[PDB]
Amino acid sequence: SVAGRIVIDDVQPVVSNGRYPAKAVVGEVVPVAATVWREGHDAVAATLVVRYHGTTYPDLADPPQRLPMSPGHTPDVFHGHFTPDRVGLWTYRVDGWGDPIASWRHNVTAKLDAGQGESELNNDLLVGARLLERAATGVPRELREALLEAAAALRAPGDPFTRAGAALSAEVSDLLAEYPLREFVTRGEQYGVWVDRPEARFSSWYEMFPRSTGGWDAEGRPVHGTFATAAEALPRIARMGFDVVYLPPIHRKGRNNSVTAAPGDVGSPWHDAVHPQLGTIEDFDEFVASARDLGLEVALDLALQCAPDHPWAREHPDIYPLNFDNDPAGIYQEVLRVVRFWISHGVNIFRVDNPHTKPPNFWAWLIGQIKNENPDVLFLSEAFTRPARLYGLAKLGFTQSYTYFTWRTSKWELTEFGQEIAAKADIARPNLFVNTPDILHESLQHGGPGMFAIRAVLAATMGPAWGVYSGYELFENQPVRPGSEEYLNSEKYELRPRDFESALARGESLEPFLTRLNEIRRLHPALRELRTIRFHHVDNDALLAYSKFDPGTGDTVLVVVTLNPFGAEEATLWLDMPELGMEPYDRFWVRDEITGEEYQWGQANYVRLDPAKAVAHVLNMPLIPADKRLQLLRRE
Amino acid sequence: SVAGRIVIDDVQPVVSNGRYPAKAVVGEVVPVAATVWREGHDAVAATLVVRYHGTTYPDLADPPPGVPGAVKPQRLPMSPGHTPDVFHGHFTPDRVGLWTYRVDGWGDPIASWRHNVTAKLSELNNDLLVGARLLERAATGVPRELREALLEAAAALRAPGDPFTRAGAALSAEVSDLLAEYPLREFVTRGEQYGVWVDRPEARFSSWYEMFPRSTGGWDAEGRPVHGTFATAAEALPRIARMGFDVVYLPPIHPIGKVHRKGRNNSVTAAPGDVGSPWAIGSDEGGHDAVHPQLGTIEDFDEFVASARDLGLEVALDLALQCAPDHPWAREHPEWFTVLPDGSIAYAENPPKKYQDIYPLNFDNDPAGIYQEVLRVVRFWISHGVNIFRVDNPHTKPPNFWAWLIGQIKNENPDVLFLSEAFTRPARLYGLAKLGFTQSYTYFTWRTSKWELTEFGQEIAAKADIARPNLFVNTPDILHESLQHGGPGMFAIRAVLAATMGPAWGVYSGYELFENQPVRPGSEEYLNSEKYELRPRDFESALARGESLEPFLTRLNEIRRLHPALRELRTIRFHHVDNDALLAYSKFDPGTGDTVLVVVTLNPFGAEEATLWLDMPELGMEPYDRFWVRDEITGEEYQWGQANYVRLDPAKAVAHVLNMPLIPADKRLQLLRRE
Ligand SMILES: OC[C@H]1O[C@H](O[C@H]2[C@H](O)[C@@H](O)[C@@H](O)O[C@@H]2CO)[C@H](O)[C@@H](O)[C@@H]1O
């Protein structure tokens, strides 16, 4: 936000006055917006100055393209955009300037229309000549003639419409777009945007315990799985459309959180070594390779705690939390070594467990030290903490963040949530996990199969990043103690194998539905975007309705979802017609990616959802028109 | 907003990321707020660092090349609020100039330990020594008197003698208080330094009266008006003083141009002997540093200013930067004008307003030149005792110009104040305010509905850090259709709205006389405007006959003077009242705790009753509390609760200005709070 002959103000995207960069992915249309003004009726304009700086990640805590900007409905507010083409730091700046030809074009096309004579139009014409002559200076010598001829024409004697003809022409208009006469160019402030690989914003996660991939012996007793049986587990997870496979720690406490373990109990998985029963570093290397061949990524948990008997407890003075204060340099250097080790082992995704319990400046340093060395490493923060810290950690450079989504159950909670996630889109990318081996929500506990499908739609559509724990597809809703948020017989304390193949064959698996959800996502680029979520009024406290669009392709999707998993719910859906790139009186066609149903729709549309037939409607909304798709993206 | 071992974020008051300072006046309690956090359950705290830099006004915008011109750090505590991780502070600047606040964030180890050593509800525990270790450290930060408290406390928990209750000293009140004044601060993260330009109180709180000196002349025995002087104008002042207005604003007192002189009722050609527009500054007699010959001399004016000072009034001159075709600059410096190809100076305009009698100045051709001359002119009147300027459509002149001029003036003399008459888009309006314009003219004149006024009042309180408004009930160019049809009731309604809502309010003469005559039907311009003819008024007669708002405007000013609440802007809270043509709002002083509540009808014809719903904790109370009130309009007392029945007869009185129960000290500051 600057002040000169031209004033530039309230520029976006600015993050905490500029202490941190904005978040983006390669291919994302980043909308920019600034308040630009000057004196009098005189014309003003703005240029968006975008520059790439490479893959140099900045340390966030103490331990050239010239693109045009168009004005909008909101006076004195100009809007711009850009689509970064590679991972790295890009910087936008807003150049403000007076537009004398724009002014002249208007103030003279007015008089010459409509319909004044050569006498009263003589002066403005001769000034227009002075401008084209001035503008010509900015045009390379080989392209000038057009302008000079045009200028000499206005000063030649005759009829206003004939004189102004050349200056008003297309040839000139185009040429002036490429080389404009920009007066009093005021340079705005430089602002950063860290651009990440698309998997940072759009990715479907599947959490799986490798030890539970074991199966059973002919007797019925479970087998402790290896990286090999886990590698065998992968193709259905691949076939379900998940692209990230998150494993809990691969490095006492007994069955169902009991303080003393019975001999032969598995123990809780929660630093540069693999579990002997799982395999070797070589076995894991093979596991990672197997995942890559299926087009899957591996995500490891980076939990920074020690069991009382850890090598660090003895060497560098059921869990011990680490102390970052006594020997900062020491711990800082070892964590970095550990993380680098797995990066070297083909792991480019880390799920940082409870970051809010560890120093903010630590994360910043670690996130930075890694990202400079290799910018493709991504970090997800499992911070279920106050919003200050949650978003605070995201600003620090955490790629994605775990959200309040599981406790957002009501229509109103969900709208407030969806709206908030779209608002904080520049500072945080959310990961909506339907639940975790730590979180079994009371809604799912009583709602049954319908509930599981409802939540999966909500997460998969609303969240560009969504996740499922192993077993969600088998409707795992049995809670340990009544009212507890923990699972009965948690996979964390025992070998929990599952015959998914059987469930599917019997028809007791959400496995096919989760696939459709991922197919829909893959097909619809609108489900990738976050900022474009808009809610639409559906009159029924049990139904929820929201849209989304891709500013690049114009793809539009509308979701209509029941929150009652037992009985059917009907209502009238009222569409914000221009929001979807239309007029209120317009009528269009829609395809339901769920049922395959096709219908003519208007502003007001009757809707009915039977949780026996399908919990939601994922409509294929008419493609947003090019000119309307940037207007719709707009900030102010 | 910073990042370190402690994170400081979403700090307020920040203006355009810090490009411009926040607005304040001496005695104003400035609330500060920040989001401060750290890791885990460990204790965090914040310190507000206030530093004075003197009366050095900063240049806020990049000026053109060639254009020349010319302590004891407070550490104040920040308490947390209802909103987690948000700390709140405040400060009252005692001396006019630049002030800078910073938010220091830090870990509180004793706070942590205090909590962690409870635990007491037991043994074995010899962290009762890490506590001793802390108090011993903390003691270093305490002056060698009152450090004893801490040493005794530490030595106590270091003593083996008896239970873990030897730590009672460390946990004590005496210690807790002492540690508030001199805390043990870990990992002190210094936040961003943010400016606040503190002005003299007349910048925020002042009542203006606009008067044309030429119109103070009176009539001859034949009925024809007489052209007034600075002497007759000096005579018209005491009633303006008696009405409680402290600022007397005069339109240009400069020789009006003879060339292209506009005649009666905006007629393009003037009849012989027509007065002409005061805003067409400059004839053969003089320019912008000269007085109108018919008004008097520089000496006459000096006497006029002195007369105003003796009545406790201060003069506000109009700073209009245009020239009549016959101005001294038009002959001497045609490089300050936009000479068209045909060799003529461009005629002045402001869509839909055309000004055939003026030439607008050109700031681009010779920037250094014009910049230096405007300064000279403004300095001239400052030297003549004028410390207030009512700037004419500043939005028509360069932004960087204003910034440079306001700066160049305030460095030399920080007491000079500038009011922007910018009726333009909000971007530019507030934009100019951020640039350093002391007060701004508002959309107030067209905010008629209950909705419009609540949306307005709320907006003015929101933009309070970047702009101080001046609510003028009417101007010699603004005669609103509300006033044209509403009759005397309307006049009173608007005056209440302006005087209460706006810490700065204004009245243009003839208003106390209910002048509703508009030139053309539906036009906002006055029939027979004072700008083109000598419009004298016998105020004394009207008062006597019974057609003067003169006594009511005085009560409004008395009320204002008595109530420090009607000075503060940010504290405007609207209270729900069922009638849609009735409005209710509060205001409080964060220093004195004074509370005022206004209940005003917008229907000037018939009476309006309704049930008033109070946001009880906002008046520093609980919902089932029941208090007493004293109307400043009626004088008497009434029993009021959370819900109160109200009735307003515009025949009896258009509004109720209640003297609400004084807000309790501890509650005062929570009602001020930002987040
Ligand atoms: O040429 C002088 C010009 O003066 C008046 O215009 C004033 C306006 O009335 C005031 O409100 C002031 O703040 O701005 C204008 C300055 O030009 C007359 O209205 C106008 O006809 C006349 O030409």
Residue numbers in the entry:
A (entry chain A): 0 to 62, 88 to 275, 282 to 300, 309 to 355, 378 to 696
B (entry chain B): 0 to 69, 86 to 136, 143 to 696
Sentences from the study reporting this entry:
GlgE is a maltosyl transferase that transfers maltose from a maltose-1-phosphate (maltose-1P) donor to α-(1–4) glucan chains. GlgE is essential for M. tuberculosis and its depletion leads to pleiotropic stress effects and eventually cell death. GlgE is proposed to catalyse the transfer of maltosyl units to α-glucan chains through a double-displacement reaction in which an aspartate residue acts as a nucleophile forming an β-maltosyl-enzyme intermediate, while a glutamate residue is thought to protonate the phosphate and deprotonate the acceptor, acting like an acid/base catalytic residue16. Each of the protomers of M. thermoresistibile GlgE contains 5 domains and 2 inserts that have been described extensively in the first reported GlgE structure and therefore we will focus on the particular characteristics of M. thermoresistibile GlgE.
In an attempt to obtain a maltosyl-GlgE intermediate state, GlgE was co-crystalized with maltose-1P. We could not observe the maltosyl-GlgE intermediate but instead we found maltose bound to only one of the active sites of the dimer. The fact that maltose was present instead of maltose-1P is most likely due to GlgE slowly degrading maltose-1P to maltose, since maltose-1P was free of maltose contamination and we confirmed its stability at different temperatures for long periods of time. Significant conformational changes were however visible in the structure especially in the S domain of the protomer with bound maltose. The S domain of this protomer exhibits conformational changes with several residues of α1 (V132–L136) and α2 (S146–150) losing their helical conformation. Moreover, all four helices comprising the S domain of the maltose-bound protomer were found to be shifted with a maximum distance of ~6.5 Å when compared to both the maltose co-crystallization and the apo structure. This brings domain S of the maltose containing protomer closer to loop 2 of domain B of the “apo” protomer. Unfortunately, the majority of domain B, including loop 2 and the antiparallel β-strand lid, is not seen clearly in the maltose-1P co-crystallization structure “apo-protomer” and thus it could not be modeled.
